[PDB]
Symmetry: D2
Subunit: 239 residues, 4 copies
């Protein structure tokens, strides 16, 4: 069994890769930025006793994504789990937001998930199996001032999740999303943090591992009847 995680060089992506490796998956580590950080994650994954390698690719670019999937399948022999975790923010108030701030976030976060799903589908259709897990965010469900672009993409990812789920269900593929709340890795002044904590019933920020554990559950045989769903992992801030 083989998995690919996008934007896996650090934070939630890395934790996801490490957890999948803990479950017995071979894991390909996609990255955009630092090679050495990605290579370190690959070594951490190998320490779990599975195979791993890093692949550089901009998920916004359909050609690069196609080459990425082809390499994973070439190397691992299959593609059983795809985790679309890569994402960026370029925050600004509505009136101040630049066109490139919109475009960059939409192409990376929304088109990137589409690209990865699209390029992975032919392999999964031939397998007649697969699990795709997309990362959304609590703000995709509730909105947030200053992030109109990011919110649009994470809500859009939920819609894409549902559509892909309905389209691919007949061929044995599940498609789900995980929406983190306020997670320590993603983390500000202690004053701002204090206010954010008042929004959270559990009264603490979540950890990378909370997100990774949920993704791993969705990628497992234990979740084979779950599809089209968004699992909110947010300490109760949105219910």
């Amino acid at each position: 069994k083989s998995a690919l995680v996008t934007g896996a060089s650090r934070g939630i992506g890395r934790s996801i890769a490490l957890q999948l490796a803990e479950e017995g998956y071979n894991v390909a580590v996609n990255y955009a930025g630092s090679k050495e950080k990605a290579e370190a994650v690959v070594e951490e994954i190998k320490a779990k006793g599975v195979d791993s390698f890093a692949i550089q690719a901009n998920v916004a670019d359909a050609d690069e994504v196609k080459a990425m999937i082809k390499e994973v399948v070439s190397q691992f022999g299959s593609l059983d789990v795809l985790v679309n975790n890569a994402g960026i923010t370029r925050d600004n108030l509505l009136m101040r937001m630049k066109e490139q701030e919109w475009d960059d976030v939409i192409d990376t976060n929304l088109k990137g998930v589409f690209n990865c799903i699209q390029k992975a589908t032919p392999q999964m259709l031939r397998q007649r199996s697969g699990a795709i897990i997309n990362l959304s965010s609590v703000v995709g469900a509730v909105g947030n001032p200053g992030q109109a672009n990011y919110v649009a993409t994470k809500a859009g990812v939920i819609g894409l999740t549902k559509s892909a789920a309905r389209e691919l269900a007949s061929r044995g593929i599940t498609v789900n999303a995980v929406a983190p709340g306020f997670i320590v890795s993603d983390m500000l002044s202690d004053e701002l943090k204090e206010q954010m904590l008042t929004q959270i019933p559990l009264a603490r920020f979540g950890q990378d591992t909370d997100i990774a554990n949920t993704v791993a559950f969705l990628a497992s045989d234990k979740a084979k009847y779950i599809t089209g769903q968004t699992i909110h992992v947010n300490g109760g801030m949105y219910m």
Copy 2:
């Protein structure tokens, strides 16, 4: 008669956009009719609107183009003196199976449907902040909430529009502006009718009221959200779909 309040409707040359424009006119709004291609259809709608006794004119703009949208808003505010209601109705489809969908089919739908809504909201914002009032109503779709095979691009945009609705709602609320969405179900005017009766039959089985909806059903809900009757409603998506999604 030039009304004290004015509306802009995007993609208003036919179907749902046209009925919305006509309904806003009936409610006493001057209405600007935006169109992309067919000027003749837009100008006929303008005449229908003036027959209601309000002012109207047609404006050509591609909503995906930030600069055309800015010029469009400036022209509406210039002609009418304000922009009290913005209805983001313009949208296209480029349907295809996931594994076949062309990059251009994805891009065009995202730019018109999602970026278009962002552009219109962004460019309208300064005027509405100046007014300390306004209503923005965005058109989504039932498929934005439930997904639909063959429409992954369109679905992504209509879900994205609901997100954008909530974000703009939170950002603009404190200055007196509401932002909401309406999600039509299966509406007769959105159908080519090229599809067989058996396909119609199947779609009808999804709808408890066992009929397709009409443009006016959507228009009436938009007009409600655009009225003082709905001043405490914001960030909401109103589904008008005969019960097919609850």
Copy 3:
């Protein structure tokens, strides 16, 4: 056209009745408590140029509700709009909540809506038309400490709304709900109110008329294709 509004002697119920009367509806005013307050509402309604009368009935009691509907139909000739607005709270923390605090709220708020819908259905089926509008609450969607009973009923009312909508749609009846946020009539220290205001994007409490306007829209020909829906009227506190 004839309407019945439960718990209409004051607050949101009264405002709803007055608005329906403004729309040309004859309106029956159901009440549980003070007769003179209800009679005053009936006079206010008559001032709009429509017919009106008050009926005493505990909505938790199926016999009394049956007699209530029968009287409305007898008097008006039909029952075109039913607004289930009657509801109570008996707040307490989970560990402190008494059995009667649970039972009273469930029977009034949830069984009461069921009773009214059930007893109204035979008339509406014979008409092959009608609009039923149930009152929920933002807390039905988000929960609230100290109101486990109330929350259960208002979420339950949403479920009942959907089920009735699906069951009655084929006979020309729509069934919808309206969920108010924090409304001035329902209203505390200015300190508590200040905190509640921080939960509301519009930064103000809503008014009875906001709820009444939405109910009136749902009861009108303009909403004939809307059914099974919950309309949140809450200034953006829940989206």
Copy 4:
């Protein structure tokens, strides 16, 4: 082997409740098996559970009865020393068309399904506050989210259970307790099979995965929520339904 952690499952003598109990046992929880009527079935499940290597016993209680529930919780805490997981699975149906449904059909379903869940949560609360930890998982249903003709009572309770889930979640969060719900779709064990294949065919058309689910699908999700893997998930309803509702 007596585990360090213990679970109570209501209505666990068969179907979904039984699979949940067995799955929790496999995860290393001592499991108490609650039943209302059939003691023989409950005791057989107890033996299946002990075969997994954990402790188990059967307890009779009507969940609608606050006093029986209190005695039940006391007995579990007494036997096991704690109550770390509470699964509120017990529930009944009394189906009928709206205009025909008997008052007793409404009352019995509300008392068992909705009041029963409240009673169990209320009586478990003191022990879990004492522990400063615990997981409560409530069983809802897809029909709680979408409605279903002929089940207005059952639907009201399953929607009510989601509300109760969110309210208890908010109230208990600060003291280390999570409260979530699982909403099964159409599961083979919930069907009498008395229904025709054509009725089955129709139900299958609502499900993208084009198969009914199994008890184990529900059990696995409950076990996930009951684990340390889900400590930051609270107030949520997880739909396990093959895509029929998204």
